[model samples]
Target: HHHFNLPPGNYKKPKLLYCSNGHFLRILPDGTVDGTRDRSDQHIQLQLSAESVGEVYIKSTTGQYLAMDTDGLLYGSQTPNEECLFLERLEENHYNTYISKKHAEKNWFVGLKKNGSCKRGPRTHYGQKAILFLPLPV
Candidate 1:
């Protein structure tokens, strides 16, 4: 099995999440999450806070917390809530997958399309390329 390199627990330092589909996970000014082909300023960096051993909260530079709704929608919230929690798991391919902690039973994952668009949570699965991400240090 491949060993996964876990992200830092530091909240001040930022990192970039590069999607396996050739895009970077980005947070828009409108408090939404998407993928960008290039490393633009808006979605360039993100802060990851560890809530527990394998749980985390992803926050954008805009101070919005990454969240998933019960219906399997991805969004950014101004306030951190139960929905903001995610289970950070490492796959056998050495890539990471962020699954919704609140909707754990639904298998909701944070995903992005090949065209740099957001993939709905419920539409994603563990083995999908759209949901695999590489955490890069900034």
Candidate 2:
């Protein structure tokens, strides 16, 4: 029951998770998770590590883990925990979507608005453009 589609092993390289709405998922040094339009910024680069078959942990270069709480607030954690786990799923459009593993029952997704802001998790749905992301090499 734990198995799902697994990402390729090459995800170890740093990548920019660009939302379909034209923003990159970024983790600020101050531990905030947001979206930025600047493609070349250092904060835009993130490391995706597979924790299990369909699970992953996203880490910033500054050593913070991307986390989502029950309330769907995206933030950064100093240590990896249940809140830092995400279910990574590749969509039909060749983009990917990440759902909070801790809140899987609610389908809380990692999303970014068109204006480069974090979209609240509970407000996100499965196939929305705001939730679709393409992992581009940094």
lDDT against the true structure, each candidate = 0.81, 0.83
Candidate 1 regions with alpha-carbon error over 4 angstroms: 1-12
Q: Compared with the true structure, what per-residue lDDT tens digits does model 1 show for residues 86-110?
A: 8887775477888888787778889
Which prediction has the highest TM-score against the true structure?
2
The TM-score values for the models, in the order shown, are 0.88, 0.92
Clashes of each: 0, 0
Q: In terms of TM-score, how similar is model 2 to the real structure?
A: 0.92
Best by lDDT: 2
Query: Cα deviation of 17 in candidate 2 (Å)?
Result: 0.6
lDDT of 1: 0.81
